Structures are given as C-alpha cells and as structure tokens.
A paper describes a structure:
We purified full-length hTRPV1 in lipid nanodiscs using soybean mix and synthetic lipids (POPC:POPE:POPG, 3:1:1) and subjected these two protein samples to cryo-EM. The corresponding 3D reconstructions showed C4 symmetry and yielded nearly identical structures, with a slightly better resolution for the sample purified in synthetic lipids (2.58 Å) compared to the soybean lipid mix (2.90 Å). Despite the map for the soybean lipid mix had lower resolution, it represented a more complete reconstruction of hTRPV1. In addition, while both structures had residues 602–626 unresolved, the structure in synthetic lipids was also missing density for residues 713–720 and the corresponding region was not included into the model. The apo-state structure of hTRPV1 shows multiple well-resolved densities of annular lipids in the TMD. An exception is the vanilloid binding site where a bulky head density justified its best fit with phosphatidylinositol (PI), consistent with the previously solved apo-state structures of rat and squirrel TRPV115,17,19,32–34. Accordingly, the head of PI is accommodated by polar and charged residues of the linker domain (H411), the S2-S3 loop (D509 and S512), the S4-S5 linker (R557 and E570) and the TRP helix (Q701), while the PI tails face hydrophobic residues of S3 and S4 from one subunit, and S5 and S6 from the neighboring subunit.
Here we report the cryo-electron microscopy structures of human TRPV1 in the apo state and in complex with the TRPV1-specific nanomolar-affinity analgesic antagonist SB-366791. It includes a transmembrane domain (TMD) with the central ion channel pore and an intracellular skirt that is mostly built of ankyrin repeat domains (ARDs) connected by the three-stranded β-sheets and C-terminal hooks.
Author numbering:
A (entry chain D): 550 to 601, 627 to 687
B (entry chain C): 275 to 601, 627 to 769
C (entry chain B): 688 to 769
Amino acid sequence: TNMLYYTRGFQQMGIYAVMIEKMILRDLCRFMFVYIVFLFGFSTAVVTLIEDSYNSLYSTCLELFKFTIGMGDLEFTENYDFKAVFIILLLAYVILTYILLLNMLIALMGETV
Amino acid sequence: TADISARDSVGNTVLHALVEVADNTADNTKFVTSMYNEILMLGAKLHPTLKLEELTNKKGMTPLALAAGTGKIGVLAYILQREIQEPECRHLSRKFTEWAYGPVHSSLYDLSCIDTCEKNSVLEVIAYSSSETPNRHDMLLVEPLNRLLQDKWDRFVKRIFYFNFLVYCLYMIIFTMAAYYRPVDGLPPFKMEKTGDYFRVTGEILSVLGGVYFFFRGIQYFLQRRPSMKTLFVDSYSEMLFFLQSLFMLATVVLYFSHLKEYVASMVFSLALGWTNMLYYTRGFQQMGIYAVMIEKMILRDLCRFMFVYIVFLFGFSTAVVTLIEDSYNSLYSTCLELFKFTIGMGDLEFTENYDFKAVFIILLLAYVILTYILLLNMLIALMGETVNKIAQESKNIWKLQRAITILDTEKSFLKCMRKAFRSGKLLQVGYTPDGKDDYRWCFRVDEVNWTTWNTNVGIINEDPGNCEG
Amino acid sequence: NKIAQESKNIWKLQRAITILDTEKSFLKCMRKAFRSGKLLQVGYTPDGKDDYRWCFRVDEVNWTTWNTNVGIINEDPGNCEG
Ligand SMILES: CCCCCCCCCCCCCCCCCC(=O)OC[C@H](COP(=O)(O)O[C@@H]1[C@H](O)[C@H](O)[C@@H](O)[C@H](O)[C@H]1O)OC(=O)CCCCCCCCCCCCCCCCC
Ligand SMILES: CCCCCCCC/C=C/CCCCCCCC(=O)O[C@@H](COC(=O)CCCCCCCCCCCCCCC)COP(=O)([O-])OCC[N+](C)(C)C
Ligand SMILES: CCCCCCCC/C=C/CCCCCCCC(=O)O[C@@H](COC(=O)CCCCCCCCCCCCCCC)COP(=O)([O-])OCC[N+](C)(C)C
Ligand SMILES: CCCCCCCC/C=C\CCCCCCCC(=O)O[C@@H](COC(=O)CCCCCCCCCCCCCCC)COP(=O)([O-])OCC[N+](C)(C)C
Ligand SMILES: CCCCCCCC/C=C\CCCCCCCC(=O)O[C@@H](COC(=O)CCCCCCCCCCCCCCC)COP(=O)([O-])OCC[N+](C)(C)C
Ligand SMILES: CCCCCCCC/C=C\CCCCCCCC(=O)O[C@@H](COC(=O)CCCCCCCCCCCCCCC)COP(=O)([O-])OCC[N+](C)(C)C
Ligand SMILES: CCCCCCCC/C=C\CCCCCCCC(=O)O[C@@H](COC(=O)CCCCCCCCCCCCCCC)COP(=O)([O-])OCC[N+](C)(C)C
Ligand SMILES: CCCCCCCC/C=C\CCCCCCCC(=O)O[C@@H](COC(=O)CCCCCCCCCCCCCCC)COP(=O)([O-])OCC[N+](C)(C)C
Ligand SMILES: CCCCCCCC/C=C\CCCCCCCC(=O)O[C@@H](COC(=O)CCCCCCCCCCCCCCC)COP(=O)([O-])OCC[N+](C)(C)C
Ligand SMILES: CCCCCCCC/C=C\CCCCCCCC(=O)O[C@@H](COC(=O)CCCCCCCCCCCCCCC)COP(=O)([O-])OCC[N+](C)(C)C
Ligand SMILES: CCCCCCCC/C=C\CCCCCCCC(=O)O[C@@H](COC(=O)CCCCCCCCCCCCCCC)COP(=O)([O-])OCC[N+](C)(C)C
Ligand SMILES: CCCCCCCC/C=C\CCCCCCCC(=O)O[C@@H](COC(=O)CCCCCCCCCCCCCCC)COP(=O)([O-])OCC[N+](C)(C)C
Ligand code: NA
Ligand code: NA
C-alpha cells in the first residue's frame, strides 16, 4: 500500500494518488463513520431479534457488511421470531446503505473530483 | 397631515406595508431598503421620540420580524446592516463602528431583537419558521447572524450539545446492551434472578425514562412550536424520529407488561431509529452535518423518486414471474424477495426451474435486470451526482439552520440551569439618543478589515476618543 | 447534466398531449374542452364594433416600469374587474 508513495514521481499516477488521499479523508471518513452508525445500529437490532449461529454481534455486523460488498443473504437466519421485523429491518439497512449511501458516496466522489 | 404611524385594520404600519410588498428581487430590494431610510429620517425629523420599527400589527410582528418571517432577506439585510451616517438620524443606525485604526475597524452590530425580545426574535422567526418562507435557509448568511450563532456555538452551545450527544450515545449503549441481553426464555415480565439481571432492568428503567423523555420533548415541540398539518411531515424530520423512537419504546413497555413477545418488534425498531438518529448530532459538525443534509435530500429527492419507480417494476415483474411459476417460489414474497436480490448483487438467474416457459422467464428477468440493476440503480448514482452539484451550498445553509435551531432550543432549555441565553453581546454605548441620553445597545463586535477604503471617512466612529476599547 | 431542463420541457409536452387527448375524449361526457378563458371585451374593431376575444388572464408585476405608460389599458375606467 506504501508503493503508492512512489506515484509522486509520475504526474498522472501521482495526482491519482492525491485523489486517493482526499477521498479517504473527505469521503470515506464521512461515509464509513455514518455507515458504522447504521451497521451497528441495525446489527444490534437484528441480534436483539435473533434467539438461539447468528446470535452474535460479530456474525451480524459481518453478515450485514456483506450487503455492502454485494453478498447479502436476506435469509441468513431463520432463527428470528418476527419476520416482518427482520425484513423491515434489513431492507431499511439495504436501502439506507447499499442503494442510498454507497451510491451517495459515488456522488460525493464525483463532486470531490 | 398624514400620521406616519399607519395602523390599519390588519395593524400594518408603513414599514410593515413595505415589508409585505417586497419580493426579494434586485429592483425591489434596491427600492424598499432605501425607502426605510427616508421614512426613518422623516420619522426622526418630523416626529421624534417614536422609533418607528418597534411598532407592531394585529398579529404582533415588527417589520424586522415581518421580514424575518415572510422571507425577506434583502430587506432584513438592510434593517440589520443599517448604517445611517448623519446626526439626528444616527440612533437608528444598526451597524455602528466602535473604532477604525487603519483598514481594520470593529463594526458594532446591535442585537436588539435578533435574540431575546419579548416576542418574535429574528433568529426564532427564521429558525422557528414554517416551511415555505422563501429564502429561509439563506437568511442566516446575513451578518451578524452567521457570526452570532457561531459565537453562541463556540461559547455556550458546543459544550451542552456534545454533552447531549454523549448522554444519547450512552442512552443507546445502555438501551442496546439492555436489549442484546434480553431474556429469550419465557414470556414477560421477567425477574431479577441473577446479579446481572439487576443491572439489566436498570438499563431497562433508564431506557424507558428516556423514552418518555423524547416523548414529552416531542410533545412540547408541538406545544411550543405549533406546526401545521403540512409542517408535521415536512421541515421537522427530527422531532418526529426521536418522538417516533419513543412510540416504539413505550409500546415496548406496553407489550412487556401486556404479556406478549411483541415488545421485541418495537424494542428493535427503537434501536434502528435510535442509532440512525445519531445522525441528528452531526449538526454540530460542519463536514458531517452537511453530509447528513446530503443524506436527507437524497432520501427525499432521489430514493423517493427511485424506490417508487423501483417497486413498480419489482412488483411488476414479480407478479409476472410468480404468474409463470407453477407448483417453493410460487409466492409473491419469495419472488419479490428474490428479484430484490438483483439490486444487492445476489440475483440467481435460475432461482426456479419450476417454470413452464424459459424464454418467457429469462426475457422477463433480464428485462428486470437491465431496467433495474444496470439502468435504474446507475441512473440513481447519476441523479445523486446532479443533486450533489445542486445542493452544495444549499446544504450548508440548511446545516447552519439545523445548528441554529439547536442553538435556540438550547437557550430555552437552560433558562434556569446555568443562566439565561447569556445575551451574546456586550451592552455598550453607541452614541446618544435624540432626546439627549445614552443609548446602551446590546451589540455584537465584528472586527473587519478593508484594504480599499483607504480614506476612512470617520462618520460614526464612536470611541475615536479611544482607539480599540482600552 | 445535459437533460435537466430539456427533460422538463419534454415533460410539459407529455402533460400537454395528455391535456388535449383529455379534451377530445370528453367532448360530450361533461362539456367541450371548457374553452379555458373568459370571453372579454378588449377594445373595438376598426369597423367600429366590439371585439369579445376569448382571453386568458396573467397577473404580472414589474418593479422597474415605474412610469406605467398607459397605452392599451382597457378597463382603466374600472380598476381590477369589479
Ligand atoms: C408505525 C410507524 C410507521 C412509520 C411512519 C411514521 C412517520 C415517520 C417519521 C417521520 C419522518 C419520516 C422521515 C423519512 C426519512 C427522511 C429523514 C430525513 O430526511 O431526516 C432529516 C433530518 C433533518 O433534521 P431536522 O428535521 O431537524 O432538520 C430540518 C430539515 O433539515 C429541513 O429540511 C430544514 O428546514 C431544517 O434543517 C430542519 O427543519 O435528520 C434527522 O432527523 C436526524 C437523522 C435521522 C435519520 C436520517 C436517515 C433516515 C432513516 C429513516 C429510517 C429509520 C431507521 C430504520 C428504522 C427501521 C424500521 C423501524
Ligand atoms: C475504523 C475503526 C474500526 C470500526 C469498526 C466498526 C464496526 C462496528 C463497531 C465496532 C466497535 C464497537 C463494537 C461493540 C463493542 C464490543 C462488544 C460487543 O460486540 O458485544 C457486547 C454486547 O453488547 C453489545 O453488543 C452492545 C453494547 C455496545 C457498547 C459499545 C459501544 C460501541 C460504540 C461503537 C459502535 C458504533 C457506533 C457508531 C460509531 C461512530 C459484548 O461483547 P460480545 O462478545 O459481542 O457479547 C457476547 C456476550 N455473551 C456471550 C454473554 C452473550
Ligand atoms: C415503502 C413502503 C413499503 C413498500 C414495499 C414494496 C414491496 C412490493 C409491494 C408491496 C405492497 C403490495 C403487495 C401486495 C399485497 C399483498 C397481497 C399479495 O402479496 O398477494 C395476493 C395475491 O395477489 C397478488 O399478489 C396481486 C394483487 C395485488 C393487489 C394489491 C395492490 C398492491 C399495490 C402496490 C404494488 C406495487 C405497485 C407500485 C406502487 C407504487 C394475496 O396474498 P398472498 O398471501 O401473497 O397470496 C397467497 C394466496 N394463496 C395462498 C391462496 C395462493
Ligand atoms: C522507473 C521505475 C523502475 C521500477 C522497476 C519495477 C517495475 C516497474 C514498476 C512500475 C512501473 C513504472 C514505469 C515507469 C516508466 C513509465 C513511463 C513514465 O515515465 O511514466 C508514464 C507511466 O507511468 C508509470 O508507469 C508510473 C507507474 C508507477 C507508479 C508507482 C505506484 C505503485 C508501484 C508498484 C510497483 C510494483 C513493483 C514490484 C515489481 C518489481 C506516465 O508519464 P509521467 O512520468 O507521469 O509523465 C511525466 C512525469 N513528470 C512530470 C514527473 C516528469
Ligand atoms: C422512513 C421513516 C422511518 C419509519 C420508522 C418506522 C417504520 C416501521 C414500520 C412499521 C411498524 C410495524 C411493522 C412490524 C409489525 C410487528 C410484528 C407483527 O406483529 O407482525 C405480524 C405480521 O405482519 C406482517 O407480516 C405484515 C407487516 C405489515 C407492515 C409492512 C410494511 C411496514 C414498513 C413500511 C415502511 C414505510 C416507511 C416510510 C416511507 C413510506 C404478526 O407477527 P409475525 O410473527 O411477523 O407474523 C408472521 C409473519 N410472517 C407471515 C411474515 C412470517
Ligand atoms: C428511508 C428509510 C428506508 C426505508 C425503511 C422502510 C423499508 C421497509 C421495507 C419493506 C416493507 C414491506 C415488506 C414487509 C416485510 C414482509 C413481512 C411479511 O408480511 O412477510 C410475508 C409477505 O407476505 C406478502 O403477501 C408479501 C407481498 C408483497 C411482497 C413482499 C415484499 C418484497 C420485499 C422486497 C421489497 C423491496 C423494495 C423495498 C421498498 C420497501 C411473508 O409471509 P410468509 O410467512 O413467508 O408466507 C409465504 C407465502 N406468502 C408470501 C404468499 C404469504
Ligand atoms: C460498553 C462500552 C462502551 C462505553 C460505554 C460504557 C457503558 C456502560 C457499561 C457497562 C454497564 C453494565 C455493567 C454491569 C453488568 C456487568 C455484569 C453482567 O451482567 O455481565 C453480563 C452482561 O451484562 C448483562 O447481562 C447486564 C445487561 C446490560 C447492562 C446495561 C446497562 C445498565 C445500566 C447501568 C449502566 C450505567 C449507567 C448509570 C450510571 C450512573 C455477562 O453476560 P452473561 O452473564 O454471559 O449473559 C447475560 C446474562 N443473562 C444470561 C442472565 C441474561
Ligand atoms: C438516569 C440517572 C442518571 C444516570 C445516567 C448515566 C449516564 C448514561 C446516559 C444516559 C442515561 C440517562 C437517562 C436517559 C435520558 C435520555 C437521553 C436524553 O435525555 O438525551 C438528551 C440529552 O440532554 C439532556 O438534557 C439529558 C438530561 C441529563 C442526563 C443526566 C445524566 C448524564 C450522566 C453522564 C454524563 C457524563 C459526562 C462525562 C463528560 C466527559 C438529548 O438532548 P436534547 O437536548 O433532548 O436533544 C435531542 C432531542 N431532539 C432531537 C428532539 C431535539
Ligand atoms: C402520535 C400521537 C401520540 C400517540 C399516543 C401517545 C402515546 C404513544 C406511545 C405509546 C402508547 C402505545 C402506542 C402503540 C400501541 C401499543 C401496542 C399495542 O397496542 O399492541 C397491541 C397488539 O399489537 C400487536 O399485535 C403488534 C405489536 C407490535 C407492533 C410493532 C410496531 C410498534 C408501533 C408503535 C407505534 C407507532 C405509531 C406511529 C405513529 C404515526 C396490544 O393490544 P391487544 O388488544 O392486546 O392486541 C393483542 C394482539 N395479539 C395478541 C395478536 C398480539
Ligand atoms: C465531542 C463528542 C463526544 C462524544 C463521545 C463519544 C464517542 C465519540 C463520538 C463521535 C466522534 C465525535 C468527535 C468530535 C471531535 C472531533 C473534532 C471536531 O471537532 O470535529 C471534526 C471531526 O468531526 C467529528 O469527528 C464528528 C463526528 C460525529 C458525528 C455524529 C454522528 C454519529 C455519531 C455516532 C457516535 C457513536 C457513539 C457510541 C460510542 C460512544 C470536524 O471538524 P468540525 O467540528 O466539523 O469543524 C468545526 C465545526 N463548527 C463549524 C461547528 C465549529
Ligand atoms: C423494449 C420494448 C418493450 C418490448 C416488450 C415485448 C418484448 C417481448 C419479446 C418477445 C415475445 C416472445 C418471446 C417469448 C416466446 C413465447 C414462448 C415460446 O413459445 O417459447 C418457445 C421457445 O422460444 C425460444 O426459446 C426462443 C425465444 C425467441 C425470442 C428471444 C428474444 C426476445 C426478446 C427481444 C427483446 C428486444 C426488445 C426491444 C429492444 C431491441 C417455445 O416454448 P418454450 O417452452 O419456451 O420452448 C423451450 C424453450 N427453451 C429451449 C428455452 C427451454
Ligand atoms: C428496455 C427494456 C429492457 C430490455 C427488455 C428485453 C430484454 C430481453 C432479454 C433477453 C433476450 C435474449 C435471450 C432469450 C432468452 C433465452 C430463451 C432461449 O431460447 O433459451 C435457450 C437459448 O438457446 C440459445 O441458443 C441461446 C443463444 C444466445 C445466448 C442466450 C442469451 C444470453 C442471456 C444473457 C443476455 C444478456 C444481454 C441482454 C440483452 C437482451 C436455452 O435452451 P436450453 O433448453 O437451455 O438448451 C440448452 C442448450 N442450448 C442453449 C445450446 C440450446
Ligand atoms: Na454486487
Ligand atoms: Na454481488
């Protein structure tokens, strides 16, 4: 990752790596903070609902982080007790994170660039 | 002769009428702002001992607070930056000059009814404005208001806000950690058998005391700040979500002692809101606050248009697919659910071999895929990108208003805890009344420097006997 | 970025085509197209008769044409159609 220092001897790669640092400090920094509010916000909301194994805060923050990377199973646990709660609570996470906030990130990168 | 106090059936004097007539155009603003001076000169020339701007109408609104409320920003800019440079019309000057050494000069704006008048202060009348007041978000760029709220913030509210944040951070930790460790075995209410269960009910007590808290604090927002049916569900997207959090959080108390497991359905919606409602407290932070303004606009401009159209297609093709399935994915849930997976990148194009015509099925999904994943989610990114270009400074001006509403509720809350609102300005003499007395106006300093007004026409300069308040 | 106002102008035309098919459809259900304007006198013909043109009002305000060159103004005998 520190090879990206030595882009600074190259105008088009160096500027690119300047456009990396600004995003990590402007856009990811604002993003990932808000993202972890929702993530831990719905994660706790889901493992609170689970009873029993996905009754952990890791294995539910881990499974809800998969919706980010396009690997979210909307049925990763049948060990709930109210489905409408669970489904309302994930699709809320999905809409607010995958559709809204990752695509909002692309928008802010676009305005940053 | 004509009585300059032009009280009418509605009570609007001439200055009121000149606020009501404005349009926030350049030709009209250039006009009406001038006219106040000559009306004010004449009011001070032909009928002294009656400063004309304190007068009100039937509804009880000064022309200052009538410009604050009716959305008149260029009018309001004049009345706040009013700088009359001539004797016997100078007490009406609103922006004084406490000194000027070289280019530097300390402007001395008055905080007459920007904050803490007996009714309708400019910050209230802007902050506590309804929804469709034009220019509402730009009306705090007007000096001294931009630098007055940043003064109250850095000096009073930044320390109480970051405390209220912390108390809400721990309220969530206490409520989260009291819900994670809930009793799975049995039907409520539950017992404090183990030692940890005493700490757990404690976090449940402390959880409900905050649910009734944000409940009452969401009631009295509708008793202090009386909204209309349009401004319930618009312009107040926070006082509802913290109040809504309490509805779930108190239904959680109903359904715990009503002997049901449905308390989980409500207790869990209080957590998702509760952490999602941490994004309120970004409004004490410029870059995070604007970001959260760029969240609300998307949810209301872009998701709102998007998700509606998306659910037309989704239910449009879902019904089209389960119509084709025969038999298990012969449900409208398990087909809307499977077709929603193409959105999140988890679409199996072969999630059912229990069809009867494959070309129908495949034409019908790839139509859904192209029109939703490739077109409409990427179209969403495009519209966000055009939104972000639009709402760049229009979100910073919503932010300073979010912070402004916070600065004023903080004043009203701590009206007896520590002090009043602190008055955010030094009582200072600016000159002399036309009746021959001191003035002593609550004024807010603004050190300003200008490298082109080299002459420095003295005019007002008050402590020119001094040099810099020493 | 290109099609921002070029799509609002396609929109008003989509709505326009809807407004006119709606007229043609309900030509006998309720009424004709409603004629969307008040038959009003605007002056006098050059042959010396009334005009009575189906006209559409547009309240307009301008804060720079202070002189108000009278010119046409028709119900200046009145003031605001009272
Ligand atoms: C049985 C129940 C069924 C439900 C229906 C019942 C009614 C629903 C509730 C009504 C509301 C519905 C909201 C829908 C989503 C949109 C939310 C949103 O735009 O909010 C922005 C808000 C801004 O502040 P404010 O309002 O103070 O500022 C306003 C505002 O800027 C204004 O433009 C300016 O004039 C001025 O600045 C000021 O006047 O920010 C916050 O309030 C903090 C952040 C809040 C979170 C933002 C993210 C959105 C989360 C939504 C989902 C909730 C979480 C998941 C729950 C799972 C299911 C339970
Ligand atoms: C870039 C830096 C890295 C970021 C990573 C981000 C990733 C997400 C966050 C990561 C950091 C925080 C994770 C939680 C702390 C560990 C405890 C836990 O998981 O579970 C605790 C339970 O109780 C709870 O889960 C609720 C209590 C939360 C209290 C801590 C506040 C965290 C604040 C930040 C939160 C976000 C708020 C927004 C932040 C701005 C106990 O531990 P356990 O072992 O899980 O329980 C098993 C107990 N049992 C066996 C008896 C049943
Ligand atoms: C943000 C808010 C949430 C949004 C959620 C969005 C998610 C999508 C939409 C969600 C809401 C609507 C879902 C359908 C209503 C339930 C009935 C059903 O599913 O199946 C019914 C069948 O018949 C049909 O499925 C077709 C009949 C549809 C009539 C309802 C119109 C819905 C309008 C809105 C539609 C979108 C139009 C565009 C909207 C602008 C009967 O119920 P069942 O149990 O399924 O059938 C089993 C019967 N059996 C056992 C005898 C075989
Ligand atoms: C010379 C390096 C020898 C390295 C040998 C090692 C292998 C080769 C390694 C890397 C490739 C480097 C090739 C350099 C020559 C290409 C032409 C050029 O000058 O630049 C051009 C292409 O620019 C590039 O190709 C720059 C890419 C390197 C960026 C470094 C980050 C990660 C390195 C990870 C490396 C993994 C290493 C693991 C495997 C060994 C662009 O033109 P410019 O220069 O922008 O224009 C003038 C700039 N000026 C204004 C400053 C004047
Ligand atoms: C965005 C602003 C923030 C809003 C925050 C608050 C939002 C919260 C919303 C709603 C709160 C209540 C929802 C949960 C109900 C409690 C559980 C319950 O009793 O379930 C019952 C089932 O009931 C159903 O299966 C039907 C569910 C109807 C609601 C679906 C849409 C709600 C989301 C609209 C979103 C629009 C948002 C606004 C935008 C337009 C019975 O229990 P069960 O065990 O589930 O029964 C079997 C279930 N099974 C057959 C499925 C297996
Ligand atoms: C800004 C804030 C963000 C938004 C926050 C709020 C978001 C709230 C989100 C979602 C709220 C809406 C879904 C509720 C959850 C399901 C609960 C339920 O009743 O399940 C039953 C559905 O029974 C049906 O009849 C469903 C018919 C409609 C399609 C299902 C939704 C598709 C999910 C994708 C929607 C994507 C679009 C998203 C738009 C929302 C299941 O019953 P069952 O026991 O399995 O019985 C099987 C057979 N049966 C189905 C025939 C009965
Ligand atoms: C968190 C980090 C972030 C920073 C913030 C720090 C936040 C505060 C931090 C910690 C406060 C809590 C410490 C006491 C409990 C520890 C012992 C215990 O019971 O352990 C158990 C977990 O815990 C529980 O089961 C108790 C439930 C959670 C307590 C919620 C806070 C209570 C309010 C008062 C708080 C102070 C407020 C008022 C102050 C004036 C161990 O689990 P177990 O036994 O394996 O299984 C669960 C038990 N069961 C199976 C029987 C169901
Ligand atoms: C309970 C007995 C005390 C023990 C509790 C132990 C603490 C555990 C915590 C939380 C548990 C306490 C009960 C929960 C209350 C609900 C949350 C709440 O009120 O938030 C309010 C805080 O604003 C206040 O004025 C809070 C009241 C004072 C709390 C005193 C305890 C803090 C101790 C710890 C201090 C540590 C300091 C360390 C410094 C480094 C929210 O502010 P608001 O102005 O309403 O604005 C939002 C509402 N709006 C969006 C609608 C506008
Ligand atoms: C707003 C102005 C002020 C409001 C008033 C001031 C106070 C407000 C605060 C608190 C007072 C309580 C208000 C809510 C009602 C309590 C729950 C209840 O009655 O449950 C009933 C059932 O319930 C269920 O069957 C489902 C319960 C879970 C629903 C989850 C969503 C909670 C919504 C939260 C509300 C969000 C609403 C959003 C508002 C837009 C219990 O009654 P029952 O007859 O025994 O039914 C048993 C049925 N069963 C056996 C099949 C299970
Ligand atoms: C003080 C708060 C204490 C909270 C303690 C709790 C832990 C810490 C919590 C949160 C981190 C807060 C650190 C604040 C100090 C950083 C430097 C700074 O001032 O701002 C900088 C960084 O800005 C941020 O770091 C703001 C991030 C908080 C946004 C709140 C939303 C979600 C919170 C979820 C929290 C999960 C909680 C669960 C775990 C406890 C940016 O500068 P600025 O300020 O924009 O510039 C001037 C602004 N002005 C114009 C207004 C003057
Ligand atoms: C965009 C504007 C909206 C248009 C809306 C209307 C579009 C509708 C389009 C077409 C309508 C007809 C298609 C379905 C045929 C009926 C079923 C049938 O008889 O299938 C036959 C099979 O036939 C095939 O397997 C070959 C299918 C040929 C068509 C493929 C391209 C059509 C999409 C072009 C899209 C371009 C769109 C325009 C852009 C350029 C026989 O039955 P079977 O049981 O299936 O036989 C075994 C099948 N198996 C071997 C596969 C297993
Ligand atoms: C604006 C509105 C949105 C657009 C709406 C319209 C969109 C309409 C979309 C798609 C229309 C085109 C596909 C039709 C569906 C297949 C039906 C069929 O005949 O299946 C047979 C295909 O037999 C072949 O020989 C297929 C050869 C071409 C590649 C198949 C398509 C690839 C899917 C990806 C295309 C991605 C690109 C998408 C571009 C369209 C299967 O026969 P079998 O029984 O399994 O036999 C096995 C062995 N055999 C295959 C050798 C025979
Ligand atoms: Na993906
Ligand atoms: Na994927």
